Each structure stands twice: as structure tokens, then as C-alpha cells.
Design an enzyme around this catalytic site. Structure first.
Site, short mmCIF file in Angstrom:
data_model
loop_
_atom_site.label_atom_id
_atom_site.label_comp_id
_atom_site.label_asym_id
_atom_site.label_seq_id
_atom_site.Cartn_x
_atom_site.Cartn_y
_atom_site.Cartn_z
N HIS A 168 1.67 1.51 -5.70
CA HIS A 168 0.25 1.06 -5.80
C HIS A 168 -0.62 2.23 -6.25
O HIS A 168 -1.49 2.08 -7.18
CB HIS A 168 -0.18 0.46 -4.47
CG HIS A 168 -1.63 0.17 -4.40
ND1 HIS A 168 -2.21 -0.76 -5.20
CD2 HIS A 168 -2.60 0.66 -3.60
CE1 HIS A 168 -3.51 -0.85 -4.87
NE2 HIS A 168 -3.78 0.05 -3.93
N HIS A 218 0.83 -1.23 0.00
CA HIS A 218 0.00 0.00 0.00
C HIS A 218 0.86 1.28 0.00
O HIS A 218 0.70 2.13 0.84
CB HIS A 218 -0.96 -0.05 1.17
CG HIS A 218 -2.02 -1.06 0.96
ND1 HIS A 218 -2.00 -2.25 1.61
CD2 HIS A 218 -3.09 -1.06 0.13
CE1 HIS A 218 -3.04 -2.96 1.22
NE2 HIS A 218 -3.73 -2.26 0.27
N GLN A 254 -5.50 -17.85 -2.98
CA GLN A 254 -5.59 -16.99 -4.20
C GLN A 254 -6.76 -17.43 -5.10
O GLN A 254 -7.58 -16.54 -5.57
CB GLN A 254 -4.22 -16.95 -4.90
CG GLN A 254 -3.21 -16.02 -4.24
CD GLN A 254 -3.67 -14.57 -4.30
OE1 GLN A 254 -3.85 -13.98 -5.36
NE2 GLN A 254 -3.92 -13.99 -3.13
N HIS A 302 -6.09 7.31 -3.13
CA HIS A 302 -7.11 6.43 -2.52
C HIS A 302 -6.56 5.70 -1.32
O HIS A 302 -7.37 5.26 -0.52
CB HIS A 302 -7.74 5.46 -3.52
CG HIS A 302 -6.91 4.24 -3.74
ND1 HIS A 302 -5.82 4.23 -4.53
CD2 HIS A 302 -7.09 2.98 -3.33
CE1 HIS A 302 -5.27 3.02 -4.47
NE2 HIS A 302 -6.04 2.24 -3.76
N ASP A 303 -5.25 5.51 -1.22
CA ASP A 303 -4.65 4.81 -0.04
C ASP A 303 -3.63 5.72 0.69
O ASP A 303 -2.82 5.20 1.44
CB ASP A 303 -3.97 3.50 -0.45
CG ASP A 303 -4.86 2.26 -0.49
OD1 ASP A 303 -5.77 2.14 0.33
OD2 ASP A 303 -4.57 1.38 -1.31
N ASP A 356 -8.36 -0.81 -8.17
CA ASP A 356 -7.66 -1.18 -6.94
C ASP A 356 -7.15 -2.60 -7.03
O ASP A 356 -6.15 -2.86 -6.34
CB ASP A 356 -8.59 -1.14 -5.75
CG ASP A 356 -7.88 -0.92 -4.46
OD1 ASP A 356 -6.64 -0.60 -4.49
OD2 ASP A 356 -8.58 -0.88 -3.46
C1 LIG Z 1 -8.19 -7.46 -0.48
N1 LIG Z 1 -7.19 -7.79 -1.45
N2 LIG Z 1 -6.63 -6.88 -2.25
C2 LIG Z 1 -5.75 -7.57 -3.10
C3 LIG Z 1 -5.73 -8.97 -2.76
C4 LIG Z 1 -4.82 -10.00 -3.29
O1 LIG Z 1 -4.54 -11.13 -2.72
N3 LIG Z 1 -4.37 -9.64 -4.51
C5 LIG Z 1 -3.63 -10.62 -5.31
C6 LIG Z 1 -2.34 -10.07 -5.73
C7 LIG Z 1 -1.70 -8.85 -5.30
C8 LIG Z 1 -0.52 -8.81 -6.11
N4 LIG Z 1 -0.44 -9.92 -6.89
N5 LIG Z 1 -1.51 -10.67 -6.66
C9 LIG Z 1 -6.69 -9.11 -1.74
C10 LIG Z 1 -7.14 -10.32 -1.03
O2 LIG Z 1 -8.01 -10.20 -0.19
N6 LIG Z 1 -6.54 -11.54 -1.23
C11 LIG Z 1 -6.82 -12.68 -0.50
C12 LIG Z 1 -8.22 -12.97 -0.05
C13 LIG Z 1 -8.41 -14.18 0.63
N7 LIG Z 1 -7.38 -15.01 0.91
C14 LIG Z 1 -7.23 -16.21 1.65
C15 LIG Z 1 -5.86 -16.57 1.51
C16 LIG Z 1 -5.16 -17.61 2.24
C17 LIG Z 1 -3.78 -17.71 2.14
C18 LIG Z 1 -2.99 -18.67 2.79
C19 LIG Z 1 -3.70 -19.58 3.55
C20 LIG Z 1 -5.09 -19.54 3.55
C21 LIG Z 1 -5.90 -18.55 2.95
N8 LIG Z 1 -5.18 -15.73 0.63
C22 LIG Z 1 -6.07 -14.69 0.34
N9 LIG Z 1 -5.82 -13.54 -0.35
MG LIG Z 2 -7.34 0.89 0.53
ZN LIG Z 3 -5.57 0.42 -2.84
#
Ligand SMILES: Cn1ncc(C(=O)NCc2cc[nH]n2)c1C(=O)Nc1ccn2cc(-c3ccccc3)nc2n1
Ligand SMILES: [Mg+2]
Ligand SMILES: [Zn+2]
Length: 313
Positions: free
Chosen positions: A72, A68, A269, A106-107, A217
Site C-alpha cells: 500500500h 495497510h 462499495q 503515511h501508514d 491513499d
Molecule cells: C476508508 N477506506 N479506504 C479505502 C476504502 C475501500 O473500501 N476501498 C475500496 C477498495 C480497496 C481495494 N479495492 N477496492 C475505504 C472505505 O471506507 N470503504 C467502505 C466505506 C463504507 N462501506 C460500507 C460497506 C458495507 C459493506 C458490507 C455491508 C454493508 C456496508 N462497505 C464499505 N466500504
Molecule cells: Mg492511514
Molecule cells: Zn493509507
């Protein structure tokens, strides 16, 4: 007035594509943003002296957190630039002005922690703002920078246009609170399907700009696989730091935030693409067909995470 920014040829071309990566050269990101404003908006939109001073104050108020951060901000503005350039005639002059600034701001002053962590910590920002805690702060920091002597990039708008642009920015930045995304997308889903979606209805445009903000975002998941995969380490660096701070308050964090469960990232993911990102860019592509390259790149990345799980990477 006759002073364009001009990028090298590879960037002049690639900057137009949704999947463009702004690069590791931090000192080029201001000029990239000004370039995008000049083509999106016009060379008249803002006084260059003022715009340049607003950009450098915004940069200074982003922290050196792993995800962030200033990079970004500029990345999320470039995705908005691509959406606007591919949907020329759908957006007012004011909207183009306000949305590029909203994405950049925004952040602002993000600390690398979620709304949840602030509330469990009992941070002062959680007493001042009981919902959308960080996002109400990011908007607040935007208005503070706008009011610094020399920084009012909107000073040449009429009083009513000024109120409209600050209202576009405020709603755009509040909409980046992902807890609000789920309901905003469902309602856009029903309005599109039943055929009641009406871009002359202000409450409808608001919802559409909200989804555009969520799409910008989340746009890490719309890059080429090597960008998406290497930046995933940045976002987990924050999640796992927050998880460690949860354990210091005596709370087991969710798995996404627990570095002991790194092993399950691939499947985590998948959930995220399935429950959040694919639905986001699908509904966006239904409302704004020229944004389809975002949904196609998102689908490509889901399929690369499916290969990770199958042991083939
Ligand atoms: C909000 N937000 N903003 C961006 C992203 C993101 O993950 N963006 C991809 C990204 C960012 C850069 N490259 N790829 C997210 C997000 O909530 N992701 C998330 C959402 C839910 N989960 C659950 C797990 C997880 C991992 C390990 C063990 C168990 C569960 N892992 C996640 N991850
Ligand atoms: Mg934000
Ligand atoms: Zn953001």
C-alpha cells in the site's frame, strides 16, 4: 551520481500511467520507488546510500497486515508520482521531495485497525493523540526513522528548508485521516466555484496537497477492475477482523466491519464511491485537470460495482 535505476520496458512505460499496478514481486518495489524519486525530483535529491537505507527501515516498520502494508505504501507513492509528473510546474522542489516520502511513510506501523477501534479499546496511542490517532503515530514513526544514524535523507537541506519539508510531510500524513477529508473537500469545492482558490496562498496549497493525499491513499478504486476487485478482499479482511475485535469488546460493529453482512458489500462499495471516492477525484480534477484519468477509472469501477449488484457479476 551517474547511476540510474532502469526498469524493464513494460514497467518503464506503464509506471507513467495512473492505473499502474506495482506487481507481486516485493523485491522490485524499492527500485520502483527510487526510479520514481530520480525522475520526479532528480538523481541529486538524496544520497542513494542514505535513501536506500531509509526505504529499508520504512519497509521493516510496515506490518504484514492484509491491506495497510508495504505494498500500500508503494502504491500510494506511485499515484503521487503520476500526479506530480502530470503537473510538472505546479510544485516546488521541496514539495516533490516531501510528498513522495510522505506517501511512503503515511501508514507506518499500521496495525489494521481504525482510530475508532483504538479509542474503544483504550489503546495507549488514543491517550497520547486524541484525534487523527494513527496518523499522528505514522508521522512520529517517520521522524524516528529520519533520526536513525545514516537515515537523514534531508541532511543536505538548509535548516529552514528542512523545517519546511518536515512541515509538508506532517500536514500530508495528517490529511490521510479520512475524517478530515469531508471538510477539506467542501472548502476546496467553495473556493474553486466562488473563484477564490489561490495556489500562492500557503493555506490553499496545504488544502490541495491534502486532497492529493486523499486521492493517492484511495487509489485502489482507480486501478483496472480486476486489481480493484481482488484488492477489495484485502481491505475487507482488515475491516472484518476489526469487526470481530469490536464483538470481543461487547460492541456490534458497523456493517462494513461485520463479516455476517458480506452479502451487502456491493451496495456498501456504491456508497463509498458516491459519498467519498467520486467527490474526491471530481474536486481534484477541477483543481488539477491532468488528474482526470483517476476520475475516469473511478467511474469505470463504480459502473462495474453496479453490474455486480444487477446479478451480471
Ligand atoms: C476508508 N477506506 N479506504 C479505502 C476504502 C475501500 O473500501 N476501498 C475500496 C477498495 C480497496 C481495494 N479495492 N477496492 C475505504 C472505505 O471506507 N470503504 C467502505 C466505506 C463504507 N462501506 C460500507 C460497506 C458495507 C459493506 C458490507 C455491508 C454493508 C456496508 N462497505 C464499505 N466500504
Ligand atoms: Mg492511514
Ligand atoms: Zn493509507
Amino acid at each position: 551520481g551517474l547511476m540510474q535505476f532502469t526498469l524493464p520496458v513494460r514497467l518503464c512505460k506503464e509506471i507513467e500511467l495512473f492505473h499502474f499496478d506495482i506487481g507481486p514481486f516485493e523485491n522490485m518495489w524499492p527500485g520502483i520507488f527510487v526510479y520514481m524519486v530520480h525522475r520526479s525530483c532528480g538523481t541529486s535529491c538524496f544520497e542513494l546510500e542514505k535513501l536506500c537505507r531509509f526505504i529499508m527501515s520504512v519497509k521493516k516498520n510496515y506490518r504484514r497486515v492484509p491491506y495497510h502494508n508495504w505494498k500500500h505504501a508503494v502504491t500510494v507513492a506511485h499515484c503521487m508520482y503520476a500526479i506530480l509528473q502530470n503537473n510538472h510546474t505546479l510544485f516546488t522542489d521541496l514539495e516533490r521531495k516531501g510528498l513522495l516520502i510522505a506517501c511512503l511513510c503515511h501508514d507506518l506501523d499500521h496495525r489494521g485497525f481504525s482510530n475508532s477501534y483504538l479509542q474503544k479499546f483504550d489503546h495507549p496511542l488514543a491517550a497520547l493523540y486524541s484525534t487523527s490517532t494513527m496518523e499522528q503515530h505514522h508521522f512520529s514513526q517517520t521522524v524516528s526513522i529520519l533520526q536513525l544514524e545514516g537515515h537523514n535523507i534531508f541532511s543536505t537541506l538548509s535548516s529552514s528548508e528542512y523545517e519546511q519539508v518536515l512541515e509538508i510531510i506532517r500536514k500530508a500524513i495528517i490529511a490521510t485521516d479520512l475524517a478530515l477529508y469531508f471538510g477539506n473537500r467542501k472548502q476546496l469545492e467553495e473556493m474553486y466555484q466562488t473563484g477564490s482558490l489561490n495556489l500562492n496562498n500557503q493555506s490553499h496549497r496545504d488544502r490541495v496537497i491534502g486532497l492529493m493525499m486523499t486521492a493517492c491513499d484511495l487509489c485502489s478504486v482507480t486501478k483496472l477492475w480486476p486489481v480493484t476487485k481482488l484488492t477489495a478482499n484485502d481491505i475487507y479482511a482488515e475491516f472484518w477482523a476489526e469487526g470481530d475485535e469490536m464483538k470481543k469488546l461487547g460492541i456490534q460493529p458497523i456493517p462494513m466491519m461485520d463479516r455476517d453482512k458480506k452479502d451487502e458489500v456491493p451496495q456498501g462499495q456504491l456508497g463509498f464511491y458516491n459519498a467519498v471516492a467520486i467527490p474526491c477525484y471530481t474536486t481534484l480534477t477541477q483543481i488539477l485537470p491532468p488528474t482526470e484519468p483517476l476520475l475516469k477509472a473511478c467511474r469505470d469501477n463504480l459502473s462495474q460495482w453496479e453490474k455486480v449488484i444487477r446479478g451480471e457479476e
